[PDB]
Symmetry: C3
Subunit: 450 residues, 3 copies
Amino acid sequence: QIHWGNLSKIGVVGIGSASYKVMTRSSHQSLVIKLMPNITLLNNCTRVEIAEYRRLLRTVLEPIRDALNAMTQNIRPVGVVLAGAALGVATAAQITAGIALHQSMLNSQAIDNLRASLETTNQAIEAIRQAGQGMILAVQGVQDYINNELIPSMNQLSCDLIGQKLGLKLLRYYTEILSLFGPSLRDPISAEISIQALSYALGGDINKVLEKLGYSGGDLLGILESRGIKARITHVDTESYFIVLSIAYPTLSEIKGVIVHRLEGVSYNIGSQEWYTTVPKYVATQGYLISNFDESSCTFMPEGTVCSQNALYPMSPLLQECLRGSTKSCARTLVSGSFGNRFILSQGNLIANCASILCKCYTTGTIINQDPDKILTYIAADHCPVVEVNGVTIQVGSRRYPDAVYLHRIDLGPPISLGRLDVGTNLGNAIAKLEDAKELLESSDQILRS
Amino acid sequence: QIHWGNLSKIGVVGIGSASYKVMTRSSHQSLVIKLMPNITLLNNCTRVEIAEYRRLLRTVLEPIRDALNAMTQNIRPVGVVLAGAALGVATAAQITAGIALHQSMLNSQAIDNLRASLETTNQAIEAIRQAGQGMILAVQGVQDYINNELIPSMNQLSCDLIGQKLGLKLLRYYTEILSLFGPSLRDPISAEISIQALSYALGGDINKVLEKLGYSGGDLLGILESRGIKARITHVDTESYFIVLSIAYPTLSEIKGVIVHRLEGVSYNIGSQEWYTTVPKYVATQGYLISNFDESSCTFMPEGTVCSQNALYPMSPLLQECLRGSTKSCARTLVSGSFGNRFILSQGNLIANCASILCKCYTTGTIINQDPDKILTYIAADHCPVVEVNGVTIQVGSRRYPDAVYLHRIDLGPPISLGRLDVGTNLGNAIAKLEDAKELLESSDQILRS
Amino acid sequence: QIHWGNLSKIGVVGIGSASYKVMTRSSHQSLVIKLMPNITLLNNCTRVEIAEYRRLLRTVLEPIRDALNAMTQNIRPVGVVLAGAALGVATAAQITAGIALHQSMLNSQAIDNLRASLETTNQAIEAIRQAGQGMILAVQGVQDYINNELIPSMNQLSCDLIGQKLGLKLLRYYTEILSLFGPSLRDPISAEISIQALSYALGGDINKVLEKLGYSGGDLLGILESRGIKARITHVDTESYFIVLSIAYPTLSEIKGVIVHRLEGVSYNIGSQEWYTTVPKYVATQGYLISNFDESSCTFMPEGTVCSQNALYPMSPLLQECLRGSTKSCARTLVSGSFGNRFILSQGNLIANCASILCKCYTTGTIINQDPDKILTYIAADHCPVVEVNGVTIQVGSRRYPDAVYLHRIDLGPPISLGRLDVGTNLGNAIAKLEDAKELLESSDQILRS
Ligand SMILES: *[C@@H]1O[C@H](CO)[C@@H](O[C@@H]2O[C@H](CO)[C@@H](O)[C@H](O)[C@H]2NC(C)=O)[C@H](O)[C@H]1NC(C)=O
Ligand SMILES: *[C@@H]1O[C@H](CO)[C@@H](O[C@@H]2O[C@H](CO)[C@@H](O)[C@H](O)[C@H]2NC(C)=O)[C@H](O)[C@H]1NC(C)=O
Ligand SMILES: *[C@@H]1O[C@H](CO)[C@@H](O[C@@H]2O[C@H](CO)[C@@H](O)[C@H](O)[C@H]2NC(C)=O)[C@H](O)[C@H]1NC(C)=O
Ligand SMILES: *[C@@H]1O[C@H](CO)[C@@H](O[C@@H]2O[C@H](CO)[C@@H](O)[C@H](O)[C@H]2NC(C)=O)[C@H](O)[C@H]1NC(C)=O
Ligand SMILES: *[C@@H]1O[C@H](CO)[C@@H](O[C@@H]2O[C@H](CO)[C@@H](O)[C@H](O)[C@H]2NC(C)=O)[C@H](O)[C@H]1NC(C)=O
Ligand SMILES: *[C@@H]1O[C@H](CO)[C@@H](O[C@@H]2O[C@H](CO)[C@@H](O)[C@H](O)[C@H]2NC(C)=O)[C@H](O)[C@H]1NC(C)=O
Ligand SMILES: *[C@@H]1O[C@H](CO)[C@@H](O)[C@H](O)[C@H]1NC(C)=O
Ligand SMILES: *[C@@H]1O[C@H](CO)[C@@H](O)[C@H](O)[C@H]1NC(C)=O
Ligand SMILES: *[C@@H]1O[C@H](CO)[C@@H](O)[C@H](O)[C@H]1NC(C)=O
């Protein structure tokens, strides 16, 4: 429904389209952060530092444990039902996340079993296999430093030095835990934490964790780049100091009929002024419908755009009509003295603002002049097979854009300034004029009677 | 003064209120960054690396020392007066900071005493306690690495290797000093630096520093999360290479009469279109007055909102009237196809857009239908004690909201698009119409005297 | 062309001007990232880890190598021409970057020479002196760790432990390579990467690299602070696992006739309301023209503001006329209860809002009262040589601003609210009024002729 012919007359072309894929999650795995390292081979040389580390962790873990218990106390078997009167107030996201928290909850007996299995481990990353259960992955954030650096030096360094070295690592690890799970974490029940954000808490790298979870394949890099691998908090243990997370590797589903277009613009000249049409960087089409496209959570892979959130949001009716071929609906803005988008290659042709750059025909050696009654030049092989546009020599193919029409056959839109202060200054001026004409505007019917 | 009854008719409710606390500082402590480590036990193996490290530090420290001297030269005893004619131009913030710099500074004789005490220490963190003065905390950024890693290896590694290892740490530490205090630091006189931003310069962790400064208590986590612990520069020494900072632990004072409200919204349906009322996330009230609330510097603790800056700023009169019960003043926007806020639990009742989600009464198994001449459904126990709204079973309490009124009894506001380009396109179109009607608008009085 | 006299009547002054300098590149140097470390002295204790590291690197390097080959295949000797019909679609930036890529491409014979020289080195940073060509700088990201930590410990640590320690470093280095050159880097051809963003890939610090490249001088800190040292990808080798970059140290050219002004405001009082003129933080003048100034890529050095991008962009005509002396064109906004900009020192005089702060003359003890028919007070020595404004004692010089005129001789502009939602609410209200008056508005000819 995008009218490319009319858009090209104001210097707007598309430079690439792609399919739209979103993420859905079906399976969830468990990942436990083991906050207490195994220090058996350090022979009580870190007793003071460990005790301080535990005290600091309690101030972070206790508020989260209370928050989790506050929601799960209001969920009972019906399926399950929520005691809305007891809960009082909650958003849809909180309610949905609370149900999943109650469902994807390790049973109390499994918690006792998990506690014992954690105590016997001394590795940084270990899979815990319970009979007739899903594998639980346990990660200890300072175990590698203990096993690789501190234990081999036990016969070389003093007992006090060993404690000091571990103490530095423990306090830095607590800082990261405070950053992730401290007061900055609004609503732990509904929080979704990306695997990258957990990197330091997992030992400073996620590659081994991803391998142990079995997350691999051709879509991994795109999914990972869009931050599509998310973890949710399901249990906080303040007695044994561990945190249970539920993590899911999503599957990609193409959305039928959605095309994501990348727009690109070239400036044009009206006399001695250089103007530029204001259009979005990306737009989405589905049949007749035109919508904006938010690329903030998307990765543009060769096989399509992978987005970890909903990227489609509505576009105003006036902007839609601009994209449907109404040039007078499109706004335009002035450009700085040194503007880089003064020509573009599109469908084998050159669309250039030859009033602001030097257009020369390399084949004949002649300079290409842009008529003052026109705003753009459409260069194809029928007029110049090889062209020098800005000192760059380019060969162009057969004509795909008609020869430029006069300015009087193009209806141009209003000039605007997009800056925050410019908008405020011009809007206040407009509101003042409307407020000064209120008496005229209110009596519209009486004036229209005459 | 917020009219909750009329707001709920367009799907706006409050999901929580809290008190408002601000920070004030009374006492200040001195914290000196000792840039030159103690390398006595390294036996001259780092001579070249230390010399290069000193040269790089001078390029950073000298501009700051000149800036500090340029301000203090204009402050003289009256109990001090600023020579405004000599200074020429200065903002209020610069003037106030300059007075504090002149007041809160170690005297010249105390600088010599501080210089001698710094040279004799060899620890990463050490309290310097003078006769009849406040304690001064000295921090050395690479001393832990020297004491824990380099010195124990002196009899194992070559002299060349020792220098190379420390040289790497010195350059990395200089990079952080350049980031903190280099050309990016506009106006060192009035700059306030959070303790978190100093973390690397203090050795990579702030927990021990806070303990030594005596900063503890139940408010620490909230204050630290809001970045309420700030340091200012009071002295730069380019001969012994240290920086003196003044740091204050704030006290929290609740502002009486201020309530911070968290607003949440549910979409509503007009025929087949799904609309959403646009309102701020947080608003503040003080009696009859309604203000915007900036949450950027705030932390939402269970006992109230802790902010390190002033969070209240004015709200436009039209938006205030919307919050006072004028529904026609409130703007509305279209939502994407997959919208998450289609129901909410409030006061034990469910406010749901039953035209966009399937509402069913679990008690009787009957579907709940939303009439076309209504926009929302208000579910309470008198109609359905247990209800399923989006696959979630919820029990609701007694009625706290009236049954939905017809759409013709609700005055709805204007549809808008909040995006930056949509605003520019629509504002430009509006301005063009006003400019084309200038003659009619400027001749209003003639049209009215008839 | 800025009218300072009329601006001071609404509390706007300049607090400093500076010259404007931009960056141009003439010479370029080659920097090669050597992804494979030298591990000869580790006696194949890291065989498994190295094999995994190479496998991960291939998934990142191969897409980039294909992208580079896609552009360079379309560039042939004319002194080169682009096959636009084969390329089809490309922006000016992509075309210009592609030409430089073809020109700055190391020839195939030089690539074989470079491959052999990389294999023989074992240092973290090393210059490769190719005969009859420019010096090529080779950087290895983990070589320092191998040479300083692992090799001296070979006789002490187990062979398995050596592999584990290096494996941790390799996976972390790969993560940074994925961040820099992975799917997040769209269009590698035109990408420009700052030297700071390459810091981890170069071993965690750039100071030695800058010294080896010869980049030094008095402008280094300013150029580095504004991110003016940028690298482009010119070759990717998937057989020997290295990346060639082109890096340039820019030269600064002052732009003639451009002055960058910093603006600062003071609040004023109308009755009991405190207002503030809304103006940009920085503005630029060139003769008669007035432009906005983007400070995002600029560093304000004592010798002038150094910018790595074009900082000038157009300013709306209404805002320009405000700065040219039309006070009614300038918008104004309400301020919060605690506003810091209630006085300013300018040209040795104090401009103060004495209705909102306590102004008293220290010389005579009398309080300075601001008349309700005035909005500001201009304090000079002819009325009070030494004045206390907000508890701060300031001496002021001779009069440089006339005595405040009455409010009825000042034309004030429209009140506005700059917030995103406040703009949307008020714009929607204004659009609705225009839409309700559409029939009247498109009747101007009939209404006047009556
Ligand atoms: C810490 O690690 C040690 C091993 O270094 C653990 O001891 C192991 O415990 C398991 C229990 O299943 C036994 O199968 C192993 O034989 C034990 N190994 C050794 C060397 O004794 C120990 O349980 C861990 N936890 C604590 C608290 O010490
Ligand atoms: C493509 O652009 C042309 C030129 O702007 C449009 O022609 C205008 O059409 C309107 C009616 O919609 C007429 O009132 C104007 O006079 C025309 N302007 C001209 C000829 O300069 C044309 O409608 C656009 N095409 C589409 C499909 O929107
Ligand atoms: C570096 O540290 C050493 C200690 O390792 C300092 O020497 C100490 O100086 C204090 C001065 O108050 C004495 O009380 C200690 O007895 C000294 N210790 C030793 C072991 O001699 C030394 O002063 C520091 N460096 C410099 C350059 O002064
Ligand atoms: C609550 O909303 C109702 C409905 O929008 C408001 O009723 C309007 O009141 C104005 C006068 O303020 C009348 O001109 C309109 O005709 C009414 N609209 C209706 C009944 O649909 C009511 O004023 C609002 N209450 C408050 C306190 O603002
Ligand atoms: C790895 O480093 C070694 C040295 O540690 C390199 O061997 C040197 O190579 C240079 C250049 O050919 C010779 O001049 C030296 O005599 C060599 N030294 C030794 C001790 O043999 C080696 O080439 C590097 N690369 C590899 C792949 O091993
Ligand atoms: C400086 O400000 C004064 C006061 O606002 C401006 O005087 C106005 O001038 C316009 C014409 O431009 C008259 O219509 C108004 O009546 C004047 N307003 C007054 C006197 O209050 C004056 O023009 C401004 N100077 C410049 C150079 O723009
Ligand atoms: C040493 O550590 C062991 C194992 O935890 C413990 O049982 C014992 O009491 C410790 N001895 C001390 C702290 O003296
Ligand atoms: C070597 O460096 C040390 C560093 O402490 C210094 O004190 C000493 O004077 C230098 N020279 C000699 C000869 O030790
Ligand atoms: C690995 O190193 C050992 C060191 O003892 C050597 O004997 C062996 O030949 C090496 N193997 C290979 C495949 O290079």
